[PDB]
Design an enzyme around this catalytic site. Structure first.
Site, mmCIF file in Angstrom:
data_model
loop_
_atom_site.group_PDB
_atom_site.id
_atom_site.type_symbol
_atom_site.label_atom_id
_atom_site.label_comp_id
_atom_site.label_asym_id
_atom_site.label_seq_id
_atom_site.Cartn_x
_atom_site.Cartn_y
_atom_site.Cartn_z
ATOM 1 N N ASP A 162 127.689 76.354 141.369
ATOM 2 C CA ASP A 162 127.747 74.996 141.859
ATOM 3 C C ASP A 162 127.068 74.871 143.212
ATOM 4 O OD1 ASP A 162 129.049 72.162 141.580
ATOM 5 O OD2 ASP A 162 129.461 72.751 143.681
ATOM 6 N N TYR A 189 124.268 71.289 151.144
ATOM 7 C CA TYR A 189 124.861 72.533 151.627
ATOM 8 C C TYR A 189 123.847 73.373 152.394
ATOM 9 C CZ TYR A 189 128.438 71.455 148.038
ATOM 10 O OH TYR A 189 129.385 70.848 147.250
ATOM 11 N N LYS A 203 123.475 68.514 143.077
ATOM 12 C CA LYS A 203 123.973 67.170 143.339
ATOM 13 C C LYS A 203 122.958 66.419 144.236
ATOM 14 C CE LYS A 203 128.488 69.343 143.564
ATOM 15 N NZ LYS A 203 128.188 70.514 144.456
ATOM 16 N N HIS A 219 126.350 62.940 144.060
ATOM 17 C CA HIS A 219 127.333 63.709 144.859
ATOM 18 C C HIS A 219 128.511 62.834 145.282
ATOM 19 C CE1 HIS A 219 127.433 67.417 147.714
ATOM 20 N NE2 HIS A 219 128.664 67.053 147.405
HETATM 21 N N1 LIG Z 1 131.522 67.516 144.973
HETATM 22 C C1 LIG Z 1 131.955 67.545 146.224
HETATM 23 O O1 LIG Z 1 132.074 66.576 146.946
HETATM 24 C C2 LIG Z 1 132.554 68.890 146.633
HETATM 25 C C3 LIG Z 1 133.375 68.916 147.810
HETATM 26 C C4 LIG Z 1 133.971 70.138 148.207
HETATM 27 C C5 LIG Z 1 133.722 71.315 147.462
HETATM 28 N N2 LIG Z 1 132.879 71.216 146.304
HETATM 29 C C6 LIG Z 1 132.449 72.481 145.539
HETATM 30 O O2 LIG Z 1 133.683 73.187 145.263
HETATM 31 C C7 LIG Z 1 133.587 74.550 145.798
HETATM 32 C C8 LIG Z 1 134.969 75.092 146.112
HETATM 33 O O3 LIG Z 1 135.623 74.245 147.132
HETATM 34 P P1 LIG Z 1 135.723 74.714 148.665
HETATM 35 O O4 LIG Z 1 134.508 75.459 149.094
HETATM 36 O O5 LIG Z 1 136.013 73.452 149.435
HETATM 37 O O6 LIG Z 1 137.020 75.628 148.769
HETATM 38 P P2 LIG Z 1 137.912 76.611 147.886
HETATM 39 O O7 LIG Z 1 137.123 77.253 146.819
HETATM 40 O O8 LIG Z 1 139.176 75.930 147.642
HETATM 41 O O9 LIG Z 1 138.294 77.698 149.023
HETATM 42 C C9 LIG Z 1 137.255 78.521 149.559
HETATM 43 C C10 LIG Z 1 137.996 79.350 150.694
HETATM 44 O O10 LIG Z 1 138.888 80.219 150.047
HETATM 45 C C11 LIG Z 1 138.586 81.550 150.389
HETATM 46 N N3 LIG Z 1 138.882 82.405 149.289
HETATM 47 C C12 LIG Z 1 138.153 82.535 148.106
HETATM 48 N N4 LIG Z 1 138.711 83.347 147.244
HETATM 49 C C13 LIG Z 1 139.851 83.777 147.873
HETATM 50 C C14 LIG Z 1 140.823 84.668 147.386
HETATM 51 N N5 LIG Z 1 140.818 85.272 146.200
HETATM 52 N N6 LIG Z 1 141.891 84.920 148.274
HETATM 53 C C15 LIG Z 1 141.982 84.323 149.535
HETATM 54 N N7 LIG Z 1 141.017 83.448 149.998
HETATM 55 C C16 LIG Z 1 139.947 83.192 149.124
HETATM 56 C C17 LIG Z 1 137.126 81.606 150.773
HETATM 57 O O11 LIG Z 1 136.903 82.643 151.717
HETATM 58 P P3 LIG Z 1 135.585 83.597 151.692
HETATM 59 O O12 LIG Z 1 134.449 82.785 151.187
HETATM 60 O O13 LIG Z 1 135.424 83.979 153.172
HETATM 61 O O14 LIG Z 1 135.984 84.815 150.844
HETATM 62 C C18 LIG Z 1 136.979 80.239 151.464
HETATM 63 O O15 LIG Z 1 137.461 80.316 152.820
HETATM 64 C C19 LIG Z 1 132.622 74.367 147.003
HETATM 65 O O16 LIG Z 1 132.160 75.552 147.593
HETATM 66 C C20 LIG Z 1 131.581 73.417 146.376
HETATM 67 O O17 LIG Z 1 130.772 74.252 145.520
HETATM 68 C C21 LIG Z 1 132.286 70.039 145.860
HETATM 69 C C1 LIG Z 2 134.319 63.804 152.657
HETATM 70 C C2 LIG Z 2 132.851 63.476 152.562
HETATM 71 C C3 LIG Z 2 131.778 64.211 152.851
HETATM 72 S S1 LIG Z 2 131.819 65.918 153.381
HETATM 73 O O1 LIG Z 2 133.209 66.215 153.691
HETATM 74 O O2 LIG Z 2 130.686 66.075 154.259
HETATM 75 C C4 LIG Z 2 131.479 66.767 151.865
HETATM 76 C C5 LIG Z 2 131.975 68.154 151.725
HETATM 77 C C6 LIG Z 2 131.590 68.825 150.629
HETATM 78 C C7 LIG Z 2 130.711 68.127 149.665
HETATM 79 O O3 LIG Z 2 130.365 68.747 148.667
HETATM 80 N N1 LIG Z 2 130.351 66.898 149.910
HETATM 81 N N2 LIG Z 2 130.729 66.228 151.009
HETATM 82 O O4 LIG Z 2 130.573 63.649 152.668
HETATM 83 C C8 LIG Z 2 130.899 62.388 152.200
HETATM 84 C C9 LIG Z 2 129.909 61.446 151.875
HETATM 85 C C10 LIG Z 2 130.401 60.215 151.414
HETATM 86 C C11 LIG Z 2 131.783 60.031 151.324
HETATM 87 CL CL1 LIG Z 2 132.317 58.489 150.738
HETATM 88 C C12 LIG Z 2 132.769 60.965 151.652
HETATM 89 C C13 LIG Z 2 132.250 62.179 152.103
#
Ligand SMILES: NC(=O)c1ccc[n+]([C@@H]2O[C@H](COP(=O)([O-])OP(=O)(O)OC[C@H]3O[C@@H](n4cnc5c(N)ncnc54)[C@H](OP(=O)(O)O)[C@@H]3O)[C@@H](O)[C@H]2O)c1
Ligand SMILES: Cc1c(S(=O)(=O)c2ccc(=O)[nH]n2)oc2ccc(Cl)cc12
Length: 316
Positions: free
Chosen positions: A44, A49, A78, A111
């Protein structure tokens, strides 16, 4: 349990993927190579990013080494908010493809539903700190996404952080040509999303759970904040099953028929997080984890709360 879910475009999506938000560019190439070596087939990504080039170096090396075939990978990226204008969507996709060193994406997502003024800045601001919107609306952005399917650049299109009225808006778009395949939204035991998930699933839209571990590395974390990984109640469910808390947090959405994309740049945790196909949570466990819901969001942003398409005013 099966490792892929069928999408409404006829393709199969790995239910576990590697997240890359906040993965440092100097660490994410090895992280993705490790992930591919230990079984991950879904990555992803996003332009915003700022690490797609380095993700792509890993993908390209593992295709070149013949560790995996391109058809076996599921790569997602995205469309950032400053590219919602019709005329900018193709180029934004093409830039992601060039950085990732791919000739197609498996899935490309809007996104966020909010469009912003185009330019170099990812969050263009007015002099008082409000994000400057784009007047393009989301239905025209969707049509531009449809064109990418028809040009061969992406195999599926979808949306992210769309509330159910916004999903409904796409579904009701006059002349809709392709339905969204996925809605990727924050989801974990503190933000269980039962209403939105049910709606999407009822419409054949697969849901991807992001921040499944509660994003402990989010830049705005505060000490007073809840912590999934440290929740003694989740730890106890993990201990019962002889798994780690993270393994439980990843298995939870899998059993709700969701896709889930935990992030790590730590090789041992990348491996750990994939070892979630050898155990089952009971229904009681699942209902218990659902009971921890408190509508708590990692990803919310004050600079965009006045945008007309800000998604999180709506109940869901
Ligand atoms: N569409 C959007 O708006 C959006 C927004 C947010 C996130 N996302 C996607 O979702 C993915 C996941 O969400 P996220 O990055 O916010 O957080 P997450 O996956 O909930 O948490 C990542 C954190 O957890 C740690 N971690 C990973 N595996 C672990 C384990 N087994 N034990 C303990 N700690 C662990 C990682 O540390 P280390 O890396 O240091 O090991 C990092 O600090 C993102 O990276 C992105 O690809 C999309
Ligand atoms: C929160 C937030 C973000 S973020 O937290 O920078 C984010 C984190 C991670 C990611 O994947 N995308 N954005 O960007 C946004 C853009 C529009 C809106 Cl309505 C809300 C947000």
């Amino acid at each position: 349990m099966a490792s892929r879910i069928l999408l409404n475009n006829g393709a199969k999506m790995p239910i576990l993927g590697l997240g890359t938000w906040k993965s440092p560019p100097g660490q994410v190439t090895e992280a993705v190579k490790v992930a591919i070596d230990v079984g991950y087939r879904h990555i992803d990504c996003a332009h915003v990013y700022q690490n797609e080039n380095e993700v792509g170096v890993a993908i390209q090396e593992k295709l070149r080494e013949q560790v995996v075939k391109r058809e076996e990978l599921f790569i997602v990226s995205k469309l950032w908010c400053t590219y919602h204008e019709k005329g900018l969507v193709k180029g934004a996709c093409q830039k992601t493809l060039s950085d990732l060193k791919l000739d197609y994406l498996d899935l490309y997502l809007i996104h966020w539903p909010t469009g912003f003024k185009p330019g170099k800045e990812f969050f263009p601001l007015d002099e008082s700190g409000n994000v400057v919107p784009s007047d393009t609306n989301i239905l025209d952005t969707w049509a531009a996404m449809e064109e990418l399917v028809d040009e061969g650049l992406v195999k599926a299109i979808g949306i992210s952080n769309f509330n159910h009225l916004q999903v409904e808006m796409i579904l009701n778009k006059p002349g809709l040509k392709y339905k969204p395949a996925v809605n990727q939204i924050e989801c974990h035991p503190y933000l269980t999303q039962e209403k939105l998930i049910q709606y999407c699933q009822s419409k054949g839209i697969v849901v991807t759970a992001y921040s499944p571990l509660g994003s402990p590395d989010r830049p705005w974390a505060k000490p007073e904040d809840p912590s999934l990984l440290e929740d003694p109640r989740i730890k106890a469910i993990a201990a019962k099953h002889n798994k780690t808390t993270a393994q439980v947090l990843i298995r939870f959405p899998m059993q709700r028929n969701l896709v889930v994309i935990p992030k790590s740049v730590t090789p041992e945790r990348i491996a750990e997080n994939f070892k979630v196909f050898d155990f089952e949570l009971s229904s009681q466990d699942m209902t218990t984890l659902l009971s921890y819901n408190r509508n708590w969001r990692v990803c919310a942003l004050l600079s965009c709360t006045s945008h007309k398409d800000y998604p999180f005013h709506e109940e869901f």
